[PDB]
């Protein structure tokens, strides 16, 4: 009786509802809601009421009213399981209304979908999700898609564990939606799609994510975006969901005309798919990749594109573990809805589940599959989400008993989680993370660990071009996944900072504007560090490469950084402060990571070495020397004999006069320099020569005495006085810390376009281009009176050049001087007939241009002629460690300090040079590339000036020394 009365009340309430107006709509919707959700019917449902509601939703006149009722019925805290499934059954119709021309109906529908998503017992997801996926895929109204996308997003927060298990089904749907022509839909899909991705815990494919999204909006940007894909540095763990959005793109890329696009597509396919862990995930996509790759391998001629295409094909077959006839391996459903579904059906085998409840079991299976993906394993979590759907067709006790068994069996499928357990620990715990580095699409690391204790010294090692600098860059800026932020563990990068300070400001106020305390506290730490009262009063520009390094090392000490970072600390440091740089780290009691070239520094400091074998980070129990005992290959990697690696620099260019080494091709004398504004010159009485056999080494203390000496060697700082001598066609292959600190203004370029930038110089870098050369009277001296055939003249402008004895002669117009010494002193320009050639000498004060065109020739004989093509740039830069796949693909920004300076030296030796200087060779490169760089300097037929502090790298290589002292410098050694 009381139950039948309920049917009558609902009928009266519906009558009122179908008549409601936008005014009173919400009032009765509320009435229907509060009544329907109570214990109103004894073991049954208000069948006719749900039919009226459905018929009302499909009718223009009553759609708004009826949907608003459904909205109130589906409120976040009172939706009754007795009604829930009949509400979800209405979702498809509600979706259709979300695409209705009528402004009001469309709006109410959108709102109702959100309400339902937020109201269904999280565990009943499988009953609601299908309504939403089906609605968004068949509708053509873009506002309906945006509303549903918003509903998926709310789902992630309302039922995270359940949605996680639904990802392999959701992601493909979000990916398709990102390819919708409508720009507002693409943004919304990407956002959903971002909660979705958004699960991608890094920036490897965003640093490209914003570009990829922009691309979806404007597909004409695809070509360039494919290029940029330096490479994104795919680091995470490619999944199918991801696959639904990527494959359609890559499939067309494979069938594109340009071989370059076929090649780029394969590369992306290779990198992305080797992150597939379940073959069943990629199985449905294989048919859209295999045929294209097979066809391309047979059609393309270029061997590189072929190898790339073949590599991707092998990965696809492995991942892919592909079986006969290219069958994608059976997808395990251990995590998978099919896996949890099998589990619940087995647990329900002795229970008679009516056909009408099948949809609920499936819903329950979906929820469970997501809880597992979200790693939600406790009993209460499962009771919160699943029990409410189960009591739709089962008694509470039976439901709870089966539910608890379902959870245990499902959770038991979670893979081993075997990985390891840092906790045995030591530090105290500072940072534990399984990340994937990738500088500019270039993969430096592929799923590697990196734990670190408190108050324990370290030291990253390995060969050049591996990622030593980029690893340290991600440590500070916080690009490493899992790595704690600044508030939990503040850490301070050396010299790779970005500011905006001047070149007139001193050292004291430099560390002040940052806000690192007061001047009286900063000046106390500088004097103890090494800086004298004078060096704390001079500008940062006057500081050498060493004092700048000591400054940044001192700033890290002042900032109270828990993890001091040291990028090549011994740069220009004498045997006094080096022992202190160690003596201090030994008693500070603070953690630190030190990359270093001098192995002797790592001996007195670093207690734990972190190498770089291939793409990992195998840390070495005990220190580094103990690590060598267990792993003997940690000190014998590429010195196994290797024949396809050996190299020796090209022979130097021809130089007239240099009969002895070794081409003397450079003989300066009485060279003095005084920085305008001081009181005493930097250097003085500098006698030095250079041949085509130079084995000189500037082994000494940095600063004003050593830095200016070198700056005059290459020559940025034009010497004020003293004769300079440089043999003809002598290119000084780029060396100071100039461009080493100037490569910063070239991070947007790649290692290839860096060499093309300099040599587009010019050689323009070592042809007195670096200085001024604008001193003829120089000064007021440009008006030199040349006496030709008897009368006075002045050069108005040069024309060309031609061959002459030992130098050159240029066709230059003149200015005849009539009535000189009077008051009508005027120089009248001549014609194009009275022109007369004049020698270069003793050849720069009138022929700076005619000389440079010749020096640029013999340099291309021993660039300059070496062509600027990709292949020859690959087999050249690889010689100095730099991996080819990173040379013309990943930008310089992604390259660390070990790869930044590593490239600058590969650029100068391009044009097969006559003098190869090496400003701090061990500075950035560890022992790995140092052994190779050694032999290259031993089989070279040209000059070599190794500027270094490492007394162990000069062994059996360099003899002469350029040790400065109080300014002056007398070269000793021998030959």
From Swiss-Prot:
<feature type="repeat" description="HEAT 5">
    <location>
        <begin position="204"/>
        <end position="240"/>
    </location>
</feature>
<feature type="domain" description="ABC transporter 2">
    <location>
        <begin position="666"/>
        <end position="975"/>
    </location>
</feature>
<comment type="subunit">
    <text>Monomer. Interacts with elongation factor 1A (eEF1A). Interacts through its N-terminus with 18S rRNA. Associates with ribosomes; preferentially binds ribosomes in the post-translocational state (bearing a peptidyl-tRNA in the P-site) in the presence of ATP, suggesting that ATP hydrolysis is required for ribosome dissociation.</text>
</comment>
<feature type="binding site">
    <location>
        <position position="923"/>
    </location>
    <ligand>
        <name>ADP</name>
    </ligand>
</feature>
<keyword id="KW-0699">rRNA-binding</keyword>
<dbReference type="InterPro" id="IPR011989">
    <property type="entry name" value="ARM-like"/>
</dbReference>
<feature type="modified residue" description="N6,N6,N6-trimethyllysine">
    <location>
        <position position="195"/>
    </location>
</feature>
<dbReference type="InterPro" id="IPR003439">
    <property type="entry name" value="ABC_transporter-like_ATP-bd"/>
</dbReference>
<keyword id="KW-0597">Phosphoprotein</keyword>
<feature type="modified residue" description="N6,N6,N6-trimethyllysine">
    <location>
        <position position="186"/>
    </location>
</feature>
<dbReference type="InterPro" id="IPR040533">
    <property type="entry name" value="EF3_4HB"/>
</dbReference>
<keyword id="KW-0067">ATP-binding</keyword>
<feature type="repeat" description="HEAT 1">
    <location>
        <begin position="4"/>
        <end position="41"/>
    </location>
</feature>
<feature type="repeat" description="HEAT 7">
    <location>
        <begin position="284"/>
        <end position="322"/>
    </location>
</feature>
<feature type="binding site">
    <location>
        <position position="702"/>
    </location>
    <ligand>
        <name>ADP</name>
    </ligand>
</feature>
<feature type="repeat" description="HEAT 3">
    <location>
        <begin position="124"/>
        <end position="161"/>
    </location>
</feature>
<feature type="modified residue" description="Phosphothreonine">
    <location>
        <position position="970"/>
    </location>
</feature>
<dbReference type="GO" id="GO:0010494">
    <property type="term" value="C:cytoplasmic stress granule"/>
</dbReference>
<keyword id="KW-1017">Isopeptide bond</keyword>
<dbReference type="InterPro" id="IPR050611">
    <property type="entry name" value="ABCF_EF3_subfamily"/>
</dbReference>
<keyword id="KW-0832">Ubl conjugation</keyword>
<feature type="cross-link" description="Glycyl lysine isopeptide (Lys-Gly) (interchain with G-Cter in ubiquitin)">
    <location>
        <position position="635"/>
    </location>
</feature>
<feature type="repeat" description="HEAT 4">
    <location>
        <begin position="165"/>
        <end position="202"/>
    </location>
</feature>
<keyword id="KW-0648">Protein biosynthesis</keyword>
<dbReference type="Pfam" id="PF17947">
    <property type="entry name" value="4HB"/>
</dbReference>
<keyword id="KW-0547">Nucleotide-binding</keyword>
<feature type="domain" description="ABC transporter 1">
    <location>
        <begin position="425"/>
        <end position="640"/>
    </location>
</feature>
<keyword id="KW-0963">Cytoplasm</keyword>
<dbReference type="InterPro" id="IPR047038">
    <property type="entry name" value="eEF3_chromodomain-like_sf"/>
</dbReference>
<keyword id="KW-0007">Acetylation</keyword>
<feature type="binding site">
    <location>
        <position position="396"/>
    </location>
    <ligand>
        <name>ADP</name>
    </ligand>
</feature>
<feature type="modified residue" description="N6,N6,N6-trimethyllysine">
    <location>
        <position position="787"/>
    </location>
</feature>
<dbReference type="GO" id="GO:0003746">
    <property type="term" value="F:translation elongation factor activity"/>
</dbReference>
<dbReference type="GO" id="GO:0002184">
    <property type="term" value="P:cytoplasmic translational termination"/>
</dbReference>
<keyword id="KW-0251">Elongation factor</keyword>
<dbReference type="InterPro" id="IPR003593">
    <property type="entry name" value="AAA+_ATPase"/>
</dbReference>
<dbReference type="InterPro" id="IPR015688">
    <property type="entry name" value="eEF3_ABC2_chromodomain-like"/>
</dbReference>
<dbReference type="GO" id="GO:0002182">
    <property type="term" value="P:cytoplasmic translational elongation"/>
</dbReference>
<dbReference type="InterPro" id="IPR047036">
    <property type="entry name" value="EF3_4HB_sf"/>
</dbReference>
<feature type="cross-link" description="Glycyl lysine isopeptide (Lys-Gly) (interchain with G-Cter in ubiquitin)">
    <location>
        <position position="349"/>
    </location>
</feature>
<dbReference type="Pfam" id="PF00005">
    <property type="entry name" value="ABC_tran"/>
</dbReference>
<keyword id="KW-0677">Repeat</keyword>
């Amino acid at each position: 009786s009381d139950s039948q009365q309920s049917i009558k009340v609902l009928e009266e309430l519906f009558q009122k509802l179908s008549v409601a107006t936008a005014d009173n709509r919400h009032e009765i919707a509320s009435e229907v809601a509060s009544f329907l959700n109570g214990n109103i019917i004894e073991h049954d449902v208000p069948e006719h009421f749900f039919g009226e509601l459905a018929k009302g939703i499909k009718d223009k006149k009553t759609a708004a009213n009826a949907m608003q009722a459904v909205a109130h019925i589906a409120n976040q805290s009172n939706l009754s399981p007795s009604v829930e499934p009949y509400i979800v059954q209405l979702v498809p119709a509600i979706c259709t209304n979300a695409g209705n021309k009528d402004k009001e109906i469309q709006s109410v529908a959108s709102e109702t979908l959100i309400s339902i998503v937020n109201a269904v017992n999280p565990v009943a997801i499988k009953a609601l999700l299908p309504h939403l996926t089906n609605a968004i895929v068949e509708t053509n109204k873009w506002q309906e898609k945006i509303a549903i996308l918003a509903a998926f997003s709310a789902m992630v927060d309302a039922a995270k564990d359940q949605v996680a298990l639904r990802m392999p089904e959701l992601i493909p749907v979000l990916s398709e939606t990102m390819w919708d022509t409508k720009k507002e839909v693409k943004a919304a899909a990407t956002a959903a799609m971002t909660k979705a991705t958004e699960t991608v815990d890094n920036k490897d494919i965003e640093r490209f994510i914003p570009s990829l999204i922009q691309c979806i909006a404007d597909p004409t940007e695809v070509p360039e975006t494919v290029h940029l894909l330096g490479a994104t540095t795919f680091v995470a763990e490619v999944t199918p969901a991801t696959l639904s959005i990527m494959v359609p793109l890559l499939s067309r890329g494979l069938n594109e005309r340009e071989t370059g696009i076929k090649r780029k597509s394969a590369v992306i396919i290779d990198n992305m798919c080797k992150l597939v862990e379940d073959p069943q995930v990629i199985a449905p996509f294989l048919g859209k990749l295999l045929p294209g790759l097979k066809s391309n391998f047979a059609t393309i001629a270029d061997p590189e594109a072929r190898e790339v295409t073949l590599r991707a094909l092998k990965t696809l077959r492995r991942v892919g573990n592909v079986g006969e006839d290219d069958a994608i391996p059976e997808l395990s459903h251990a995590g998978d809805v099919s896996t949890t579904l099998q589990v619940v059906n087995e647990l329900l085998k002795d229970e008679t589940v009516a056909p009408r409840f099948k949809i609920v079991v499936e819903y329950i299976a979906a929820i469970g599959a997501d809880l597992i993906d979200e790693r939600i394993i406790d009993q209460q979590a499962w009771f919160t989400h699943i029990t409410p759907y189960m009591t739709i067709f089962l008694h509470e006790k039976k439901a709870k008993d089966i539910l608890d068994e379902f959870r245990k069996r499902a959770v038991d499928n979670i893979p081993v989680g075997p990985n390891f357990d840092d906790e045995e620990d030591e530090g105290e715990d500072l940072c534990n993370c399984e990340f994937s580095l990738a500088y500019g699409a270039k993969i430096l690391l592929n799923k590697t660990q990196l734990r670190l204790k408190r108050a324990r010294r370290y030291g990253i090692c390995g060969p050049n071009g591996c990622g030593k600098s980029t690893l340290m860059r991600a440590i500070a800026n916080g690009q490493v996944d899992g790595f704690p932020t600044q508030e939990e563990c503040r850490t301070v990068y050396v010299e790779h900072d970005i500011d905006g300070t001047h070149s007139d400001t001193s050292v004291l106020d430099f560390v002040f504007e940052s806000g690192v305390g007061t001047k009286e506290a900063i000046k106390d730490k500088l004097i103890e560090f090494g800086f004298t009262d004078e060096m704390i009063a001079m500008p940062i520009s006057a500081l050498s490469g060493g004092w700048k390094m000591k400054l940044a090392l001192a700033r890290a000490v002042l900032r109270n950084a828990d993890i001091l970072l040291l990028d090549e600390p011994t740069n220009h440091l004498d045997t006094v402060n080096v022992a202190w740089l160690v003596n201090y780290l030994n008693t500070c009691g603070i953690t630190s990571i030190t990359i270093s070239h001098d192995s002797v520094f790592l001996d007195n400091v670093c207690e734990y070495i972190i190498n770089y074998e291939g793409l990992k980070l195998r840390k070495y129990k005990g220190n580094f020397t103990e690590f060598v005992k267990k792993c003997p290959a940690a000190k014998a990697y590429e010195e196994l004999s290797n024949t396809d690696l050996e190299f020796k620099f090209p022979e130097p260019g021809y130089l007239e006069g240099v009969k002895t080494k070794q081409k003397a091709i450079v003989k300066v004398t009485n060279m003095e320099f005084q920085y305008p504004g001081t009181s005493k010159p930097q250097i003085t009485d500098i006698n030095f020569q250079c041949s085509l056999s130079s084995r000189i080494a500037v082994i000494g203390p940095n600063g004003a005495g050593k830095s200016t000496l070198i700056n005059v060697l290459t020559g940025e700082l034009l010497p004020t006085s003293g004769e300079v001598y440089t043999h003809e066609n002598c290119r000084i292959a780029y060396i100071k810390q100039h461009a080493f600190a100037h490569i910063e203004s070239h991070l947007d370029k790649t290692p290839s376009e860096y060499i093309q930038w300099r040599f587009q110089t010019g050689d323009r870098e070592t042809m007195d281009r670096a200085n001024r050369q604008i001193n003829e009277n120089d000064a007021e001296a440009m008006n030199k009176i040349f006496k030709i055939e008897g009368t006075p003249r002045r050069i108005a402008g040069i024309h060309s050049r031609r061959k002459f004895k030992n130098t050159y002669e240029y066709e230059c117009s003149f200015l005849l001087g009539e009535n000189i010494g009077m008051k009508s002193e005027r120089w009248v320009p001549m014609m194009s007939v009275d022109n007369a050639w004049i020698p270069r000498g003793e050849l720069v004060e009138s022929h700076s241009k005619m000389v440079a065109e010749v020096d640029m020739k013999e340099a291309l004989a021993s660039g300059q002629f070496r062509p600027l093509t990709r292949k020859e740039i690959e087999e050249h830069c690889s010689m100095l460690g730099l991996d080819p796949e990173i040379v013309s693909h990943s930008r310089i920004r992604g390259l660390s300090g070990g790869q930044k300076v590593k490239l600058v030296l590969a650029a100068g030796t391009w044009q097969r040079p006559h003098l190869i200087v090496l400003d701090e060779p061990t500075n950035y490169l560890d022992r790995d590339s140092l052994g190779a760089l050694s032999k290259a300097l031993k089989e070279f037929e040209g000059g070599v000036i190794i500027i270094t502090h490492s007394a162990e790298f000069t062994k059996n290589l360099t003899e002469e020394v350029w040790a400065v002292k109080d300014g002056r410098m007398t070269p000793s050694g021998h030959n």
